[PDB]
Design a protein around this ligand. Structure first.
Ligand SMILES: Cc1cc2nc3c(=O)[nH]c(=O)nc-3n(C[C@H](O)[C@H](O)[C@H](O)CO)c2cc1C
Length: 357
């Protein structure tokens, strides 16, 4: 039974980022009933990226006293905390407290901090678990990783703003996390600059697609109405798996081609930001072609950058494994820098404008 190992490894690597993805795909309904509104992603990004205090601490504790380190209790802790945090988030998302002379969503923020801590720690505690398993089972891990975002997107596309309250969606999230919990129980029972270029490009691309452009998605997309934001978020989440699949069938390791596709994706990202900086009325506002243009632009941006990410990953993996470690390091540093750079632009100076429907 080598292939049952592959199915388990897929469904186990799937849950590595499924809670944050479910949250961000349900977000087109969580806004508009909370006090924050269009500012919420701007915090939700900096919070998720400050939650990188997790992997730093796990590495510190691995370096200080590796003897006490035990991996399976760590991962069971992570998965159980994920499940309970989802069951709680089902009930405590819309609760609002009166603090600091104003309404604020403290429960939402701290529970997002906990979910982001769990998923950020999974990133660094899930790879050295596959080092002891067979090497022939290492790839279907990546299939599960890629498809981490497909099923919440499909539940949302059946939901469709509603059809059923976010409570049932979050309970489904809890059930999926419970299934990942069950599955994990069985696994243990010339010039030097040529490399620096790839690290810098991964940092840049992840800063663009994790911290910067997600931080202003409301101003960019929601101006065309609710359905524009609905489809844009859901299909931008579906478009990363299929980008990975097309990468797996038709791969290219040449640096120039991946760089040029990066430039094309960055031009699409500039078009994504240019409409945000022009709310409440961007070009072709309240027009048929406008919504399809913005949805297609988000889909193409996300796809052409996810493909580049996966192919840089294949290059790095065929070089060595310290490559993958530093890949994770650069991904996290770039995401952090992007969120920190876009925070004082959006929030203090208030360059971006809101709208009424
Ligand atoms: C707001 C947000 C931030 C994310 N940040 C990261 C991240 O820092 N690192 C990561 O690997 N995936 C991140 N992801 C998820 C990533 O786009 C997708 O789940 C990939 O499947 C990750 O392997 C993030 C997703 C969202 C919605």
């Amino acid at each position: 039974m080598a292939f049952l190992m592959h199915l388990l490894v897929c469904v186990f690597g799937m849950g590595s980022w499924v809670t944050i993805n479910g949250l961000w795909v349900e977000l087109p309904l969580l806004v508009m009933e909370l006090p924050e509104g269009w500012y919420l992603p701007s915090y939700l990004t900096v919070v998720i990226q400050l939650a990188n205090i997790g992997p730093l601490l796990v590495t510190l504790l691995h370096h200080f006293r590796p003897s006490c380190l035990s991996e399976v209790p760590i991962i069971f802790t992570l998965l159980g905390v994920g499940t309970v945090t989802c069951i709680i988030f089902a009930f405590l998302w819309n609760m609002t407290s009166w603090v600091l002379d104003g309404h604020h969503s403290i429960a939402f923020l701290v529970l997002t901090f906990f979910l982001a801590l769990v998923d950020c720690t999974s990133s660094v505690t899930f790879l050295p678990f596959m080092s002891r398993l067979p090497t022939y089972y290492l790839t279907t891990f990546f299939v599960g990783e890629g498809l981490s975002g497909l099923l919440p997107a499909l539940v949302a596309l059946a939901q469709g703003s509603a059809h059923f309250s976010p409570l049932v969606f979050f309970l489904l999230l809890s059930i999926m996390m419970a299934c990942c919990l069950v599955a994990f129980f069985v696994l243990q029972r010339c010039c030097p600059a040529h490399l620096a270029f790839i690290y810098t490009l991964v940092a840049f691309v992840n800063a663009l697609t994790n911290g910067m452009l997600p931080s202003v998605q409301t101003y960019s997309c929601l101006s065309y109405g609710p359905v524009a934001y609905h489809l844009a978020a859901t299909l931008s989440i579906v478009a990363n798996p299929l980008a990975s699949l097309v990468s797996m069938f038709l791969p290219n390791r040449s640096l120039l081609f991946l760089g040029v596709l990066s430039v094309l994706g960055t031009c699409f990202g500039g078009y994504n930001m240019a409409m945000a900086v022009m709310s409440p009325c961007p070009l072709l506002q309240g027009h048929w072609g406008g919504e399809v243009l913005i949805v297609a632009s988000w889909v193409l941006f996300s796809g052409c950058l996810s493909y580049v990410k996966v192919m840089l990953g294949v290059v790095l993996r065929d070089l060595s494994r310290s490559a993958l470690l530093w890949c994770g390091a650069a991904v996290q540093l770039g995401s952090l820098l992007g969120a920190l750079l876009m925070f004082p632009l959006v929030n203090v100076l208030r360059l971006f404008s809101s709208a009424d429907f």
